[PDB]
């Protein structure tokens, strides 16, 4: 018809297996309501009946499409479908649905009331003939095929019908695949990297003939890496099985497990077999087993194997319908002659996930688990700092095995055997989650983390003008390069905080990285000391390579004065005013691109004994005095700390605010900690006294703090900063010379 009814498929955000979400101007163009019965026609004359729903997440012309119904239509991602309303659907009297025997194995008991009757209630579901849907439960996920309906050829189902499920399972026909093949639905986290790998490879695989009409070379050597266990083979096979090409898998240890000429014949026949079924993808994992760093290679057959791989990958420039993906452990653990132009050009890091990614990975792995009601995935989302996803698979399977070990075991073996009806009753508790998270958790990470921070501007009290002109200093030229191009001034890229210790030096950097949606990689002082004492400075280049790879980002140096204080004070050691790591930092600083959005933030508390070679233009040049807090900042910081804890309202904090002057913010965030420790000790002792009183039940004495704890904490209080350091810093206010 060539009208807007020809639409492009996508992934779905909805979690029902038969609903389709669409946008508002599109749905106002088609004149429907919510919950209408809609019909989809695609390729090879297949049909889909669905419920339509409305969402603003959809764009102008796309369709949020589920995977089981897109495999029901026998189409894939990148195909076009046709949309028609079918508003004349009645109810049925008999429903014929039956499994395929290849996915129901080990199963005993009745199948009908355990799955079908928990499914076909309360959801009027549109079913057409020959359809295969998918349900979960029983620690499993089973698909189901329908055969016959009374209102031919489709109906909507309701509580007011029956389903006749009689018969034996039927073998799967030759055309479709199973649904235990992995896909785009079961990879939690790292959505941007998946989008980048999706957009980089879509054209020569979905439209191969276009590059048979245009001679422009696509990128063919694309290399992803990451710390191990993160499922690089999983995402590789997911992309290859989702976009629909021929797959073949070369693993490094198997090729090293043969003789010499047998390995040569294996690699040659593998590349010929990948040539035969074009278009196709090819995958080499554990490249460290095949082509290591050259200094770590000692024999003779290994260099011959690496030269064989170089000739075999240079000799497929003529072909353009295969593409090579590979996976190592680290980019510094490959031979440097391999990753060059014509062999391996594109580079992508997977990285470690974060709390949102951990929540999504946990949402993947409790899909067919049948949780309880008291289990709280936000708890084990926030309490699981520093983990990879295979540890999360181990954690979920460990808690499931503990629920099998505690109950539903010795209770059952003394009387009967085990079926799936009692597997329906099995849920797991949060106690097994806390038990599997307390012990038996080998945390597989000690390295540097990269994430967006969470502290916002309202978490720090006051300091308002400094926040707004820092916002001027970073936020402006990334949004308006035309004004700077008009006035010809290149922007500065350095800023140097300084101030007395204990004034909240990390919080403003966290707020700037959180508001502009920037990554964050921090380096403390102890990292500088363990790079100085070991005399190892081939690590700074790795840090700034990671920084450029994490673009955009803000790089935070904490305790820069440690290397100048460590070898003596202001007299110092026998040396002078320079060192090793700081000039290595300058040399790797000034030799990079101006527009790459890597913004370097330094910090110290001793601004006099620092090397003045860092205050050159083109480097760190912006100085901001961070002073002691004032009383309005004191009440603001005190409320911003006390917002977490339950406090009383009749207590008054302006007495101590008007009393305490010249105090660090760290002191006024530890005195509340001291008072709350005193209150928690008082409450637990009154708890054990009322327990031992009549019983040798819960009327809580106080959930908050009174004036007594604050008065005793002020009797335990202490200032942290002397007056002479304030005069040493106000020397810079009196003198006002700060260029070099």
Site stretch for its own copies (CB under 8 A), options 3-11, 242-250, 311-319, 539-547:
3-11
- Among ligand ANP, ligand ADP, its own copies, none, residue 461 binds (CB under 5-8 Å by kind): ligand ANP
- Among ligand ADP, ligand ANP, its own copies, none, residue 213 binds (CB under 5-8 Å by kind): its own copies
Residue number with CB closer to its own copies (209 or 538): 209
Q: Is 410 in the site for its own copies (CB under 8 A)?
A: yes
Q: How far is the CB of 352 from ligand ANP (least distance, A)?
A: 23
Nearest to 491 by CA among 604, 626, 600: 600
Strand boundaries in 422-518, DSSP class E: 494-498
Q: What is the largest CA-CA distance in the chain?
A: 96
How many CA atoms, within 13 angstroms, populate the side-chain half-sphere of residue 401? 8
Site stretch for its own copies (CB under 8 A), options 28-36, 300-308, 417-425, 725-733:
417-425
Residue number with CB closer to ligand ADP (92 or 231): 231
Between the alpha carbon of residue 719 and those of residues 212, 233, 709, the distances in Å are 76, 56, 18
- Residue 26 CA to residue 4 CA, distance in Å, equals 9
Residue number with CB closer to its own copies (161 or 233): 233
| Residues binding its own copies: number (CB under 8 A) | 37
Q: Which residues bind ligand ADP (CB under 6 A)?
A: 187-189, 228-234, 361, 364, 389-390, 393
Label the pairing between strands 221-225 and 322-328.
parallel
Q: Is 452 in the site for its own copies (CB under 8 A)?
A: no
- Residue whose token pair is 């700077």: 484
Residue 100, both tokens: 């395929």
Between the alpha carbon of residue 387 and those of residues 310, 390, 393, 438, 675, the distances in Å are 36, 8, 11, 14, 34
Residue number with CB closer to ligand ANP (353 or 525): 525
Q: What does the DSSP 8-state code read for residue 105? A: -
Q: How far is the CB of 182 from ligand ADP (least distance, A)?
A: 8
**Using CA of residue 184, residue 186, residue 188, residue 190, what is the dihedral sign?**
negative
Nearest to 88 by CA among 43, 49, 145: 49
**Cis check: omega of the bond before 552, within 30 degrees of 0:** yes
Angle, in degrees to the nearest 10, between helices 389-406 and 430-438:
120
Binding residues: 228-234, 329, 365, 502-507
- Among ligand ANP, its own copies, ligand ADP, none, residue 414 binds (CB under 5-8 Å by kind): its own copies
What string marks each residue from 108 to 147 as x (binds its own copies by CB under 8 A) or -?
A: x------------------------------xx-------
| Residues 24/197, Cβ–Cβ less than 8 Å | no
One of 13, 170, 210, 702 touching its own copies (CB under 8 A): 210
Between the alpha carbon of residue 685 and those of residues 404, 647, 677, 693, 702, the distances in Å are 38, 19, 12, 12, 12
Question: Binding to its own copies (CB under 8 A): which residues in 57-86?
Answer: 61, 80
Residue number with CB closer to its own copies (440 or 490): 440
Label the pairing between strands 95-98 and 125-128.
unpaired
Question: Binding to its own copies (CB under 8 A): which residues in 473-532?
Answer: none
Q: How far is the CB of 185 from its own copies (least distance, A)?
A: 18
- Radius of gyration (Cα) for the chain, nearest Å? 32
One of 88, 175, 373, 415 touching its own copies (CB under 8 A): 415
CB neighbours of residue 163 within 10 Å: 16
Q: Is 420 in the site for its own copies (CB under 8 A)?
A: yes
Residue number with CB closer to ligand ADP (224 or 547): 224
* Bridge partners of residue 224, in order along the sequence: 327, 348
Phi/psi-derived region of residue 31, left when phi > 0, alpha when psi is between -120 and 50, beta in every other case = left
Q: Which residues bind ligand ANP (CB under 6 A)?
A: 460-461, 501-507, 637, 640, 665-666, 669
- Among its own copies, ligand ANP, ligand ADP, none, residue 389 binds (CB under 5-8 Å by kind): ligand ADP
In the chain, how many H helices and how many E strands? 26, 20
| Residues 36/67, Cβ–Cβ less than 8 Å | no
Q: Is 623 in the site for its own copies (CB under 8 A)?
A: no
Q: Is 736 in the site for its own copies (CB under 8 A)?
A: no
Residue 656, both tokens: 């101590």
Q: Which residues fall within 8 angstroms of residue 664, CB to CB, at 6 or more apart?
A: 500, 501, 502, 503, 628, 629, 719, 720, 721
**Ramachandran angles phi, psi of 43, nearest 5°:** -80, 170
Which position's Cβ is nearest ligand ADP? 389
- Residue 383 CA to residue 395 CA, distance in Å, equals 13
Site stretch for its own copies (CB under 8 A), options 34-42, 88-96, 213-221, 236-244:
213-221
* Bridge partners of residue 692, in order along the sequence: none
Q: What does the DSSP 8-state code read for residue 114? A: I
How many CA atoms, within 13 angstroms, populate the side-chain half-sphere of residue 456? 2
Q: How far is the CB of 106 from its own copies (least distance, A)?
A: 3
- Among its own copies, ligand ADP, ligand ANP, none, residue 503 binds (CB under 5-8 Å by kind): ligand ANP
* Bridge partners of residue 154, in order along the sequence: 128
Q: How far is the CB of 203 from its own copies (least distance, A)?
A: 7
Residue number with CB closer to its own copies (266 or 363): 363
Q: Residue 672, Cα to own-chain centre: how many angstroms?
A: 34
Residue number with CB closer to its own copies (257 or 277): 257
Residue number with CB closer to its own copies (372 or 401): 401
Nearest to 558 by CA among 522, 594, 587, 608: 522
- Among ligand ANP, ligand ADP, its own copies, none, residue 505 binds (CB under 5-8 Å by kind): ligand ANP
Residue number with CB closer to ligand ANP (54 or 506): 506
Q: What is the DSSP string of 447-514?
A: S---B-----GGGS-S-HHHHHHHHHHHHHHHH-HHHHHHHTPPPP-EEEEE-SSSS-TTHHHHHHHH
Q: Is 216 in the site for its own copies (CB under 8 A)?
A: yes
Q: Is 8 in the site for its own copies (CB under 8 A)?
A: yes
Binding residues for ATP: 228-234, 329, 365, 502-507
Residue number with CB closer to its own copies (413 or 538): 413
Residue number with CB closer to ligand ANP (287 or 503): 503
Residue number with CB closer to ligand ADP (100 or 390): 390
Q: How far is the CB of 358 from its own copies (least distance, A)?
A: 20
- Among ligand ADP, its own copies, ligand ANP, none, residue 405 binds (CB under 5-8 Å by kind): its own copies
Residue 63, both tokens: 């369709």
Which position's Cβ is nearest ligand ANP? 665
Site stretch for its own copies (CB under 8 A), options 104-112, 335-343, 498-506, 619-627:
104-112
- Residue 119 CA to residue 366 CA, distance in Å, equals 18
Q: How far is the CB of 650 from its own copies (least distance, A)?
A: 52
Q: What does the DSSP 8-state code read for residue 451? A: B
Helix (H) or strand (E) holding 144: strand 140-149
Residue number with CB closer to ligand ADP (360 or 588): 360
Q: How far is the CB of 222 from ligand ANP (least distance, A)?
A: 40
| Residues 554/599, Cβ–Cβ less than 8 Å | yes
Q: Is 209 in the site for its own copies (CB under 8 A)?
A: yes
**Contact set with its own copies (CB under 8 A):** 2, 6-8, 61, 80, 105-108, 139-140, 199, 203, 209-210, 212-219, 394, 397, 400-401, 404-405, 410, 413-415, 418, 420, 423
């Amino acid at each position: 018809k060539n009208r807007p009814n020809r639409l492009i498929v996508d992934e779905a955000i909805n979690e029902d297996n038969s609903v389709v979400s669409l946008s508002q101007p599109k749905m106002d163009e088609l004149q429907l309501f919510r919950g209408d019965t809609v019909l989809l026609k695609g390729k090879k004359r297949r049909e889909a009946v669905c419920i339509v729903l409305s969402d603003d997440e959809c764009s102008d012309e796309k369709i949020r499409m589920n995977r089981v119904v897109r495999n029901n239509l026998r189409v894939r991602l990148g195909d076009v479908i046709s949309i028609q309303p079918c508003p004349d659907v009645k109810y049925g009297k008999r429903i014929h649905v039956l499994p395929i025997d290849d996915t129901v194995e080990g199963i005993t008991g009745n199948l009908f009331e355990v799955y079908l009757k928990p499914y076909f209630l309360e959801a009027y579901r549109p079913i057409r003939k020959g359809d295969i849907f998918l349900v979960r439960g029983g620690m499993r996920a089973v698909e189901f095929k329908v055969v016959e309906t009374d209102p031919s050829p489709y109906c909507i189902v309701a509580p007011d019908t029956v389903i006749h499920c009689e018969g034996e399972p039927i073998k799967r026909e030759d055309e479709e695949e199973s649904l235990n093949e992995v896909g785009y639905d079961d990879i939690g986290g790292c959505r941007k990297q998946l989008a980048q790998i999706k957009e980089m490879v879509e054209l020569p695989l979905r439209h191969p003939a276009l590059f048979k009409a245009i001679g422009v070379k696509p990128p063919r050597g694309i290399l992803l890496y990451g710390p191990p266990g993160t499922g690089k083979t999983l995402i590789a096979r997911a992309v290859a099985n989702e976009t629909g090409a021929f797959f073949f898998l070369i693993n490094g240890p198997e090729i090293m497990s043969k003789l010499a000429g047998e390995s040569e014949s294996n690699l040659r026949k593998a590349f010929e077999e990948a040539e035969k079924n074009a278009p196709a993808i090819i995958f080499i994992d554990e490249l460290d087993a095949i082509a290591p760093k050259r200094e770590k290679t000692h024999g003779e057959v290994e260099r011959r194997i690496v030269s064989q791989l170089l000739t075999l990958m240079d000799g497929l420039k003529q072909r353009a319908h295969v593409i090579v993906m590979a996976a190592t452990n680290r980019p510094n653990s490959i031979d440097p002659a391999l990753r060059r132009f014509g062999r391996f050009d594109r580079e992508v890091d997977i990285g470690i996930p974060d709390a949102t990614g951990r929540l999504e990975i946990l949402q993947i792995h409790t899909k067919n688990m049948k949780l309880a009601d008291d289990v709280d995935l936000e708890q084990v989302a926030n309490e699981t700092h520093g983990h990879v996803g295979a540890d999360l698979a181990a954690l979920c399977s460990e808690a499931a095995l503990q629920a099998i070990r505690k109950k539903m075991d010795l209770i059952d073996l003394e009387d009967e055997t085990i079926d799936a009806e009692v597997m329906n009753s099995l849920a797991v508790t949060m106690d097994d989650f806390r038990w599997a998270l307390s012990q038996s958790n080998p945390s597989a990470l000690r390295e540097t983390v990269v994430e967006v921070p969470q502290v916002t501007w309202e978490d720090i009290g006051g300091l308002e003008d400094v926040k707004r002109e820092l916002q001027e200093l970073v936020q402006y030229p990334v949004e308006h390069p035309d004004k700077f191009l008009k006035f010809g001034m290149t922007p500065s890229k350095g800023v140097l905080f300084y101030g007395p210790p204990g004034c909240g030096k990390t919080l403003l950097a966290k707020a700037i990285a959180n508001e502009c949606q920037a990554n964050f990689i921090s380096i403390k002082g102890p990292e500088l000391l363990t790079m100085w004492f070991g005399e190892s400075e081939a690590n700074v280049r790795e840090i700034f390579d990671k920084a450029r790879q994490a673009a955009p980002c803000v790089l935070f140096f904490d305790e820069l004065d440690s290397i100048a204080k460590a070898r003596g004070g202001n007299i110092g050691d026998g040396g002078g005013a320079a060192d090793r790591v700081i000039n290595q930092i300058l040399t790797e600083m000034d030799g990079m691109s101006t527009k790459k959005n890597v913004f370097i933030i330094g910090a110290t508390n001793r601004p006099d004994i620092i090397d003045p070679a860092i205050l050159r233009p083109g480097r760190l040049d912006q100085l901001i005095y961070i002073p002691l807090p004032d009383e309005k900042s004191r009440v603001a910081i005190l409320k911003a700390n006390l917002r977490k804890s339950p406090v009383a309202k009749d207590v008054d904090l302006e007495f101590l605010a008007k009393m305490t002057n010249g105090f660090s913010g760290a002191d006024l965030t530890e005195i509340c900690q001291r008072a709350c420790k005193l209150a928690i000790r008082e409450s637990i002792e009154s708890e054990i006294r009322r327990e031992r009183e009549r019983q040798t039940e819960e009327d809580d004495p106080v959930p908050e703090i009174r004036r007594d704890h604050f008065e005793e904490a002020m009797r335990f209080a202490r200032r942290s900063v002397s007056d002479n350091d304030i005069r040493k810093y106000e020397m810079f206010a009196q003198t006002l010379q700060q260029s070099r």
